[PDB]
Amino acid sequence: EMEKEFEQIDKSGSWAAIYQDIRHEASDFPSRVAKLPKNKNRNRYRDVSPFDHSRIKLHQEDNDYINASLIKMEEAQRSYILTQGPLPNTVGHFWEMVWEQKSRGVVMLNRVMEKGSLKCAQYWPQKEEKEMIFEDTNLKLTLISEDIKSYYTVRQLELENLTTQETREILHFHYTTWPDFGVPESPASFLNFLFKVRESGSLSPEHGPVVVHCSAGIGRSGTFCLADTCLLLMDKRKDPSSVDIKKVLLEMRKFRMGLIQTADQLRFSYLAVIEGAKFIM
Numbered sequence: 001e002m003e004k005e006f007e008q009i010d011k012s013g014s015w016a017a018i019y020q021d022i023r024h025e026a027s028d029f030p031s032r033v034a035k036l037p038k039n040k041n042r043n044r045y046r047d048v049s050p051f052d053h054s055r056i057k058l059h060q061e062d063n064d065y066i067n068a069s070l071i072k073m074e075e076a077q078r079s080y081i082l083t084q085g086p087l088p089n090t091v092g093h094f095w096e097m098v099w100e101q102k103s104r105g106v107v108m109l110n111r112v113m114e115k116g117s118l119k120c121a122q123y124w125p126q127k128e129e130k131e132m133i134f135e136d137t138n139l140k141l142t143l144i145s146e147d148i149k150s151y152y153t154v155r156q157l158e159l160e161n162l163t164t165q166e167t168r169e170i171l172h173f174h175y176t177t178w179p180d181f182g183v184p185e186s187p188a189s190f191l192n193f194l195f196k197v198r199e200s201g202s203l204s205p206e207h208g209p210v211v212v213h214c215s216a217g218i219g220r221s222g223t224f225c226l227a228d229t230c231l232l233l234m235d236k237r238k239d240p241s242s243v244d245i246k247k248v249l250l251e252m253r254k255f256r257m258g259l260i261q262t263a264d265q266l267r268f269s270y271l272a273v274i275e276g277a278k279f280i281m
């Protein structure tokens with residue numbers, strides 16, 4: 001049982017050691033498309049690339065490239081698109097991907113500014129009456145409503161395909177209180193946030209995969225998917241204690257490199273799953 005293994009690693013202070021075994025064991029696949037010179041300005045970070053096999057392709061004939069991976073968890077029957085925070089020049093591509101993949105939710109785990117630097121372009125409208133047009137991808141985005149709570153904001157957006165005049169409702173779930181350094185002390189508000197995404201229907205098989213991002217799409221984004229998948233497998237399995245978080249992480253790392261960036265994020269993920277287990281009751 002992971003709780004016992006938790007106190008073992010804790011009492012022994014072996015978190016950096018576990019974290020390094022995971023690093024060593026992690027899959028390494030080609031990322032040739034990401035490294036083409038023409039894609040240099042489509043990438044926020046030069047050492048964070050989608051693998052070619054799991055990369056999301058835009059349906060534009062010119063350049064199909066976005067820094068985004070499909071994570072397919074076969075046993076849990078859950079898919080996720082993990083992406084970087086859009087750049088000023090990729091906001092149109094981002095919304096084109098949401099459109100093309102039939103996503104219902106966008107989960108954002110960062111602030112636009114952290115540590116005095118921009119982690120993400122402002123890619124959604126701040127007011128009802130000032131909608132955004134992405135001329136490169138022929139999309140219009142309107143803020144319909146905004147519900148600001150202490151730890152997160154939920155926004156209803158209308159995305160319109162200007163070419164076909166179809167419209168869809170997108171839910172923007174914005175976790176606003178992740179600290180600039182380290183991880184939250186308690187996972188209570190992160191679990192509340194995750195249960196809210198679940199309740200919305202955004203993670204359901206009726207819809208395209210949820211789009212999850214932070215700044216690189218690997219650290220906080222990693223923690224989100226790892227916790228969701230581990231909890232769902234504990235519901236599905238005859239023996240809930242057969243769920244090994246280290247195995248689930250390594251399976252997810254076949255689809256996108258670097259998921260979970262620090263031993264602190266690993267620690268926090270264990271804590272989120274341990275506490276989420278004792279919610280279901």
Ligand SMILES: O[C@H]1CN[C@H]2Cc3c([nH]c4ccccc34)[C@@H]1C2
Nearest residue numbers: 003006007185186187271274275
């Ligand atoms: O104190 C231990 C008891 N069992 C688990 C729950 C838990 C711990 N530490 C935490 C900090 C914040 C929130 C919950 C926890 C340890 C692991």
